[PDB]
Amino acid sequence: DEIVFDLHPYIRVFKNGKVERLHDTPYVPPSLEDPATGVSWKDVPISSDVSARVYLPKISEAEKKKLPIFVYFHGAGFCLESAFKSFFHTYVKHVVAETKAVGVSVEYRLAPEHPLPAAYEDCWTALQWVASHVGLDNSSLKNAIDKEPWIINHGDLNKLYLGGDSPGGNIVHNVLIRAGKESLHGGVKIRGAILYYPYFLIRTSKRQSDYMEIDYRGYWKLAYPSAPGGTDNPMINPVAKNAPDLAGYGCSRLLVSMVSDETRDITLLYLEALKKSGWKGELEVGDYEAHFFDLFSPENEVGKTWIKRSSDFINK
Amino acid sequence: DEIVFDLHPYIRVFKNGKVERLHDTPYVPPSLEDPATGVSWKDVPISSDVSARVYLPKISEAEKKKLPIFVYFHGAGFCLESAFKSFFHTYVKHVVAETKAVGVSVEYRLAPEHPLPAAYEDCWTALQWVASHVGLDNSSLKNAIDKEPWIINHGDLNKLYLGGDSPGGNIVHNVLIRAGKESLHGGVKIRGAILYYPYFLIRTSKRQSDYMEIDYRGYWKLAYPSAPGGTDNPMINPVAKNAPDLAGYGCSRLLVSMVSDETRDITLLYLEALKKSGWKGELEVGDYEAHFFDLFSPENEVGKTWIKRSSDFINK
Secondary structure (H helix, E strand, C coil), X not given: CCEEEEECCCEEEECCCCEECCCCCCECCCECCCCCCCCEEEEEECCCCCEEEEEECCCCCCCCCCEEEEEEECCCCCCCCCCCEHXXXXXXXXXXXXXXXXXXXXXXXXXXXXXXXXXXXXXXXXXXXXXXXXXXXXXXXXXXXXXXXXXXXXXXXXXXXXXEXXXXXXXXXXXXXXXXXXXXXXXXXXXXXXXXXXXXXCCCCCXXXXXXXXXXXXXXXXXXXXXXXXXXXXXXXXXXXXXXXXXXXXXXXXXXXXXXXXXXXXXXXXXXXXXXXXXXXXXXXXXXXXXXXXXXXXXXXXXXXXXXXXXXXXXC | CCEEEXXXXXXXXXXXXXXXXXXCCCECXXXXXXXXXXXXXXXXXXXXXXXXXXXXXXXXXXXXXXXXXXXXXXXXXXXXXXXXXXXXXXXXXXXXXXXXXXXXXXXXXXXXXXCCCHHHHHHHHHHHHHHCCCCCCHHHHHCCCCCCHHHHHHEEEEEEEEEEECHHHHHHHHHHHHHHHCCCHHHCCEEEEEEECCCCCCCCCCCCCHHHHHHHHHHHHHHCCCXXXXXXXXCCCCCCCCCCCHHHCCEEEEEEEEECCCHHHHHHHHHHHHHHCCCCCEEEXXXXXXXXXXXXXXXXXXXXXXXXXXXXXXXX
C-alpha cells in the first residue's frame, strides 16, 4: 500500500520492496518465421543471472556467407522494459529483418532491484558469451550446453556490432571502454557500435530546461544510488576529470545518432571530446529532426530512415 | 472500464476485449545452472504461434546415455498461467531435477483469446516438434533452424513421456487419442503419460457440491464456447456416447493421479471406463490424501512423494 518512490507513469517502489512497472509493454513469446518479417527468435540462458533474445532473419540458399552479429543493450531508464517485451523486441526484429544480421538482445538486471553496475556486468557477460562462439562448429554442442547454433551456423564473429539506445547507449560506452582494457575471448573484436541518444550527463555552458536539470539527471541517482561523484561519476559523465580515455574504446567504427531535443547539446559535448581524444577510428553521426521515440518504428518515415541507416552501417 | 466476464481472483474480460490475469505468477527468465537445482532452461520457437521452455538437468560425465524426454502441458483453467511463469516453471524444474530428464513445457495459446481447440492443436504441434528430432545429429543444425541441441545430444526419443495437470491432463488425454489415430514423425512413440488431476466432466450417480456442479463445469464453457454437445463433448467427457475409444490411446503406460476431493469421483469413473476399454497397457494410479496444489511443491512431504513418484514412473 505504502509508496517510497513514485515516477508516473513508469515505476513505483513500495515500502515492502515491491516494484510496479504499469507502463511496460507486453511480453512477446518466441516465434518461428514471423509472418510480417520472416524473423525467428529464441530466449537463451547465458548465466544464472543473464539471458538474451537471439534473432535469425529469413536466409535464402543464395545468401551463402555468415551474417553480421548485432548485440543490443536496450534503454528505458536502467529501470524499465525487457529484451522480451514488445517495445525493444519489435525494434530489434525490424533492425534484424532490414540488416540481415544475427541479433542478440541482452536481458540485463534492472535497477532498483539490481543497482548499477549490475547492467554493465551483465552486458559484458553477454558480449563475452557471443565471443565464446569463436572457432566452434556444431560438434561443440555435445559438451557445451550454452552455445547457440544460430551463431555457430549463421553469425560472423569478424562482423560483430553493438547497439544501444538511451541508457543502453551508456552501456555500449562503458562496454567499449572495458573492451579496450580487456580482450574478448579468442581475440574477437568489436567491429563497430551504434549509440542512439546515449544517456550521458555533461555540464552544458548554459542551464537547460528543468526536465534536463532535474528529471533527466534523476535516472542516474535511481540506477546507481552510491555512485562515487554522483552525476560526475565517469560511467555517466564521460568527460569527468578522472574519466577513462575515449581513445581506449575497443572498436574501430562508431555511429552516434541524435534527435532535435535538448539531449543533443550534451551529445555534441561528447562528440567534441571523442573527436579531440585521438581515438583511432571512423565516426559517423546521425542528426535527425524528430522525436526520440519516432526512430524505433518503421511505420514513421524517420524510423524507416534510421533502421536503414543502422543496416547500412552494419553492412558497410 | 466495462466488464463482460468476472472470475475473481483469476481472470476478467472487458467489453473492449482486454483480458486481465491479476493472480498469474511472475515470469521467470532463462537461466544457466540454477544455483538451487543445477537445471538450465531456454524458450524456443516451434511455430509462429507455439513455443516451449526446454530444460536440461546437471549431467555427470559418468551418466553416458541420453535421458528420458518429459513433454509437459500445464493446467490452470485452459485460460491462465504460462510455461514461462513461476508456478508451472518451478514444478517442471523440480520434476526435471529429480527425474534427470530433458523437459519440454509447452506454451500453448490460452482461452478466451484462442478458444479450444487451439490448445489441443498447439500441444500436438509441440509433441510433433519433439518427435522431429528422430535420427538427427548436430550437423542437422546447418539447415534446420528450429531443432534443439539439448534434445539431439541429451534426449532419448525411445523414452518419450507426456505429463499434464488439470486441463493439461485433459490435453494429454486428447493428444493420446490423436497419437492412436496419427503416427508421430519417424515412428516415434509415446512410452508413457502422467495425468495428474485430469479435467474431465462425467455425470456422477449422486449430485456433487455446487462448486463441482457449477464452477468446475464453467471452465469448459469459457474454454470452448461453441463445443458441440456442451459438457458432453467427447473432448471433455471421455465416456460420452460418441466418444473416441480409450483403447485407441497411443501409449503403453499411464500414471493417473488423484487427491482426496470431489474430482476423485469423476476420475474414478474415467479409470473404470479405461479399465473396461481393452486399452492394451500398464495403468498405475496415485491416490493421495492431500490438497491439489500441495503436490506441485517439494517443500511439502506429499509434493516430494509425488515428484519422486513421477521420476520413478519416467525412469522405470
